[PDB]
Design a protein around this ligand. Structure first.
Ligand SMILES: O=C(O)C[C@H](NC(=O)CP(=O)(O)O)C(=O)O
Ligand SMILES: O=C(O)C[C@H](NC(=O)CP(=O)(O)O)C(=O)O
Ligand SMILES: O=C(O)C[C@H](NC(=O)CP(=O)(O)O)C(=O)O
Ligand SMILES: [Zn+2]
Ligand SMILES: [Zn+2]
Lengths: 310, 153, 310, 153, 310
C-alpha cells in the first residue's frame, strides 16, 4: 500500500513533508496524464454543511474526472440533521455505510476530526472545519507555489488579511515549516493576528518571521504574496470593526516587486485585490484555483488506491 | 505506625491520605473527584498551618485509593500536592504527581464554536508544559489555551 | 417479465408476501454479488419535497452502484412548483417524459399515489408520502429482521414511540401481517396510538396484539424492538404535549432481554435511545440503515428489469 | 469531652461544632451556608461512625459562632444535629436547630416566571410544616413548593 | 388615619375580612355621593407592562373622578426599561420620587411586591402580577356579588375555566374564604386545576369545595357562576391542548338556574360565554365591569386620604 492509502486528511499538522511531496508529484503526473477510470465504481459523498463554490465544485469535478460517482448534499437544511435534530455523529455513521470516502465542510472546528471517530474505515477528507484547517487548500497552494517558483524551500512568503480566522493560512504555514529556508512576513490588523499556537511552532522550528503594517515594506522582497479575506461570518461583534479589508492591493503597489513574484488568494475575494491587479503578470489566483483540480484528483487517487503506477 | 505532628491529623489503618492541598482546593477536589461517594470514613483538615506554606488543606479517606489517572488529574489542580498510600497504619506508598500527556473527558474546551460542546464526545486535551503556563491543546479544534483559561476550578 | 417489472411501489397494502420475499431474496443476492452495469443508461429522478439523509442518499447511492444516472432536486423551493406555483400533477407529468423511474418523498399523504396518475408508464417509488406509507423503509426492515432472526414468521415485535404519524410502523405492520405467527406489542402515548384502520386489519387477520405502558413488561419477551421518533413536524399544536420521547431506552433496561433480540430504529433518533445502548450487541440501527443499500438496489433492479439472472 | 476507639488528635479551644449531622448531609450543608468560605480552621469528618447514630457527620469549626437564626437554617437538613457551643475547650452550651420561619437567600424559587430571577433581589421563602413534608412559599410570586423540589446556591 | 391608609395593596392574602368590608362600604358610599376633589392635587402613575383595557381605563377614570392627575405608559415598548436595559427596581426607584401612588400590571408573578421595596413611602397597587394576584379585581367582584346576592357569607360559587393561571380566581377565592358558609365548586381541565396552595388553605379553614365535570352538576345550586378565560398567553406550550374553551355557558343551560344566580366573568371573554347568555337575566358581566369604577375609586380614597371619606 502507498503512504496515504485509506488515511484521513484532517490536518496539515498530521501530514509529513514526504506526504505533501507525494501529493504534488502525483498531481503533476495526473495533470499531464489523465486517468478516466482510476476511481471507477467508487461513490464519494460530498457533504458540505457550509457555503462553497471552488472547494465543492473542484472536488466533485475531480471525482468525475476519475470515473467516480458523487452522492451528497450542499445544504444541511434539507438533511435530517437540520430538520429532525440528528447529531452529526449519527449522520457520519449511517453515511459511512454507503460510500467509499467522505468529503466534508463544516461550520465548527473539530468537525472533520469527530467524523473519523464515527466513520469506521471510511477515509474522511476535510474540505474545511470552521477556522481550524483547510488541508486541500494547502495542497493546491503548495503545488501553485512549486510550479511557479520551482521550490518550496527558501521562499519569502507574506500573508495578508485575516490571519486569525483564516483556516487557509493556518494550513499553509504548518506546511511551509516542513520545508527549509522559508521566511514568513505576517501582515494583519491586530484583532485578526496569527494565532499564538502557530507562531510557537515557528519558534520551536527556529523559523524567521516578522510583523509589518503594510505590503509596501516587504513588497520588493517577497516571492509569494498570499492575500486573504476577512472571515466576516466568523468575526465576533466586538471584531466587527475589521469587516473592511484594511490592506488592499492595487496594480500600483506591484511596481518594485520581484519580476517573479505571484499573488495568490484562496478566494472568494471581497475588495482586498483591486481588479487592475488581474492583468499584471503577477496575478495568479485564477490559475491557482484551477490547480485544485489536479491537487484533489491526486489526493483522491492516493487515499482510495493502494498501488498507483504513473 | 508513626505520627506526623505539628498539628492534629487523624488515625487510619489502610487508605490514601492526600497531603499538601493548596488553600481551599479541598472542597474542590472533594467534588472534582467526587470523593464524597465513599461511604467510608473521610477526615478533612482545612486551613491547617504549614511552615513557609502556612494554611493548607488535607483530605483523608481510609480504605480508598486514587484511581490511575486521578493523581495525574490532581496535577493541574494542585501541583505540589502529595499522595500517601497507607496500609497497616503505614506509608507503604508515597507518590508525587506528574502532569500527564493528555486530560480526558474532565476539562471543557473554551472555544464556543468547538464541536465537542454539541456532539456526544469525551473532551481530550494535550498537555504541553509550555515553560510555566501549562499549554492545553483541544484534540478537536486543535486550538491551544493557557491551562488556567481552561481551568475554571 | 418478473412480478414487479414496471410496477409502482406506492404502499405495502398493495404488495404481497411473495412480492416482499422476491425483494429480500434478490437483495440477498445483490448484497453478495454486485452488478455495476445492471441499470446502465437509466436516468432516475430523485425528487425529495421533504428532508432526508438516509432515504435520499441510500437510494441515490444504489442508483449509482448499478450504473444508473441520477437527476433531481433536494429542495422544492428551487423548483418551479415552489416559485411559479405549478401543481404537482404538472411537475410529475413533464418529469415523466425525461426519466425512467421517479423516486419521491412528499409532505402530504397520497402524493405518491397521485403521481402514478400523471406519470404515464413511468414507475413511481414512494420514499415516503406524509405519514401514510414508507414502503422501502419496510423492505430494508424486513431484510434486517430476516437476516438477524432468520425468520419473518412467529416473531415478537414491539413497536414504540409515535405510532400514529409514524409512516414506518404503518408500512411494517401491514407487512408483518402477511407472514404467519407474528405477535405485536404496541407501546405508545395515547395521543399517538396506532391508527384504528391498521388494527382492524390485524383483527380481520386474526392477529394477536396488545397495548403496554412500558418496555419493561415485554422486554424479556421481544425479538425485535422497533423504536420510533415523535413526528414533531406533523403533530397538531394540541398534540405538542407529546414532543418529548415518553418512552426512552437505556442500556440498563436491556438486562433481561433475549440474547438474540435487536433494537431497530428508522432514525434519525432524537433522544429515545440513550447512546449507551449503541455498544450493547442489541443495537442494530446502523447496520439496519446500511441495509437500505441492498434493499433499494433490489427494488430498482426488479422494477426496471424484466428478467434478472442471479 | 474524652473519646477513644483509636488514639488520635482532635481538640479545640473556641469555635462551634455541628454534631449529629445525618450521613451525607454534611457535605451539602458545606456549600449551602458557605461555612467553608473562611480562613478559619475547619475540620470535617464525613461518614465517621459513632454510637447508635452510627454513621454521622461532624464539623468542628474553629473560632466561629452561628446565630439562633443561622442554626435554625440547619433544621431543614440536620434537625437532630445539634450545634454545640465550644470556647476555652469548655462546652458553653449545646444549641440545636429549630425550624426557622424564613429562608433568606440560598434557595432559588422554582417558578420560571418569578420576578426573583430577573431583579437584583435576595430570595426569601416562608417555611412551613405542610402535612408530611415541609412546604415553602415564595415571598414574591407566592407559589408554595414542597421543600423536596426547591433548589438553592 | 383609616385602616388602609398609605398601605400597599399587593395581595388578597394580606388584607383582612374587615379591610374588604371597609372597601365595599366606602365603595357603596362613594357610589351614592361623588367627591370630585377628593384627590385633587395628587399625581398617580398608571404603569402597565402588560395588555389591559378594563383595569387600566377604569383605574384611570377613577383617578379622574376624584380630581387626581395621571401619568404613565400603556406598554413598556418605549420606557428606558425597554430600550435601554433597565431593572424594574431602578424604574420604580426613580418613579416613586414623582408621584403619590403607583398602579402596575406586570407579566411576572411578584412584580408589585418587588415595587414595594423601592417605592419608598409611595404606595403600590397590584393591578395584576402574572398569574399570581389581581387584588382590585376581587374588590370589584365582591362589591358586585354582595350587590346581587345581598350577602357574602353562605354562598355557592362555581369557578369555571383556567384556575391554574387565572389570577382573578386566586385573589377572589382567598377573599371568599374569609367569610363563612361559602361552599365552592371547581370546574376546570385537570392541567389547569386550581393550585395546591389554595386547596391546602380551603381544607385548613374547614371550607368545602368539590370538583365536577360540567356546570350541570352545580347549575341549580350555585348563586355565583364565575366564568373565566383561558390564559392563552401564559400557558406552557406543553399544555396547548386546552387553548380553546372546554366549557361553554350557552343561554339554554341556564334552564334550571337558581333565580338570584348571576353569571360573572372578569373578561375578556372568548367563546366560553355564548352571546345569547347576554340576554338572560343572570348575565351580569358588564354590570360587573361598570362596578370597577366604585371599588377602584373606593380603594384610592382609602390609601391616599387619611380620613374616611364620608
Ligand atoms: O473563505 C475564504 O475566503 C477562504 C477559503 N475559500 C475557499 O475555500 C473557497 P470556496 O469557499 O469557494 O470553496 C475558505 O476557507 O473557505
Ligand atoms: O423520520 C423518521 O423518524 C422516520 C423515517 N426516517 C427516515 O426515513 C430516515 P431519513 O429521514 O434520514 O431519510 C421517516 O419516515 O422519515
Ligand atoms: O385577562 C383575563 O383573562 C382576566 C383579567 N382581565 C382583566 O382584569 C380585564 P383587562 O385584562 O381588560 O384589564 C386579567 O387577569 O387580566
Ligand atoms: Zn476545542
Ligand atoms: Zn417565586
Amino acid at each position: 500500500a502507498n503512504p496515504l492509502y485509506q488515511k484521513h486528511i484532517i490536518s496539515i499538522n498530521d501530514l509529513s513533508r514526504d506526504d505533501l511531496n507525494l501529493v504534488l508529484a502525483t498531481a503533476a503526473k495526473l495533470k499531464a496524464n489523465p486517468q478516466p477510470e482510476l476511481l471507477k465504481h467508487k461513490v464519494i459523498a460530498s457533504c458540505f454543511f457550509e457555503a462553497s463554490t471552488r472547494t465543492r465544485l473542484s472536488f466533485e469535478t475531480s471525482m468525475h474526472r476519475l470515473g467516480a460517482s458523487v452522492v451528497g448534499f450542499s445544504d444541511s437544511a434539507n438533511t435530517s440533521l437540520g430538520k429532525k435534530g440528528e447529531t452529526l455523529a449519527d449522520t457520519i455513521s449511517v453515511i459511512s455505510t454507503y460510500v467509499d470516502a467522505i468529503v466534508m465542510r463544516h461550520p465548527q472546528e473539530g468537525a472533520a476530526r469527530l467524523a473519523t471517530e464515527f466513520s469506521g474505515n471510511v477515509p474522511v477528507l476535510n474540505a474545511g472545519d470552521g477556522s481550524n484547517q483547510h488541508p486541500t487548500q494547502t495542497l493546491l497552494d503548495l503545488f501553485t507555489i512549486q510550479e511557479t517558483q520551482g521550490r518550496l524551500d527558501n521562499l519569502h512568503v507574506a500573508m495578508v488579511g485575516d490571519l486569525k480566522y483564516g483556516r487557509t493560512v493556518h494550513s499553509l504555514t504548518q506546511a511551509l515549516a516542513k520545508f527549509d529556508g522559508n521566511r514568513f512576513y505576517f501582515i494583519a490588523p491586530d484583532a485578526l493576528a496569527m494565532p499564538q499556537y502557530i507562531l510557537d511552532m515557528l519558534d520551536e522550528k527556529g523559523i524567521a518571521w516578522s510583523l509589518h503594517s503594510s505590503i509596501e515594506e516587504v513588497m520588493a522582497e517577497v516571492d509569494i504574496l498570499y492575500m486573504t479575506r476577512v472571515q466576516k461570518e466568523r468575526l465576533d461583534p466586538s471584531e466587527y470593526a475589521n469587516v473592511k479589508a484594511q490592506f488592499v492591493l492595487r496594480a500600483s503597489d506591484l511596481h518594485n516587486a520581484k519580476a517573479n513574484m505571484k499573488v495568490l488568494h484562496p478566494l472568494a475575494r471581497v475588495d482586498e485585490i483591486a481588479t487592475d491587479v488581474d492583468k499584471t503578470p503577477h496575478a495568479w489566483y485564477f490559475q491557482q484555483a484551477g490547480n485544485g483540480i489536479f491537487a484533489r484528483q491526486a489526493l483522491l487517487a492516493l487515499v482510495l488506491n493502494r498501488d498507483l503506477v504513473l | 505506625m508513626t505520627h506526623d505532628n505539628k498539628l492534629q491529623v487523624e488515625a487510619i489503618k489502610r487508605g490514601t491520605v492526600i497531603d499538601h492541598i493548596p488553600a481551599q482546593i479541598g472542597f474542590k477536589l472533594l467534588s472534582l473527584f467526587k470523593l464524597t461517594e465513599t461511604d467510608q470514613r473521610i477526615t478533612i483538615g482545612l486551613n491547617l498551618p504549614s511552615g513557609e506554606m502556612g494554611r493548607k488543606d488535607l483530605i483523608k479517606i481510609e480504605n480508598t485509593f486514587l484511581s490511575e489517572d486521578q493523581v495525574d488529574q490532581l496535577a493541574l489542580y494542585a501541583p505540589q500536592a502529595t499522595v500517601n498510600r497507607i496500609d497497616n497504619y503505614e506509608v507503604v506508598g508515597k507518590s508525587r504527581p506528574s502532569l500527564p500527556e493528555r486530560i480526558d473527558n474532565v476539562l471543557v474546551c473554551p472555544n464556543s464554536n468547538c464541536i465537542s460542546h454539541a456532539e456526544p464526545v469525551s473532551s481530550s486535551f494535550a498537555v504541553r508544559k509550555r515553560a510555566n503556563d501549562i499549554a492545553l491543546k483541544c484534540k478537536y479544534c486543535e486550538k491551544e489555551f493557557s491551562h488556567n483559561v481552561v481551568l475554571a476550578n
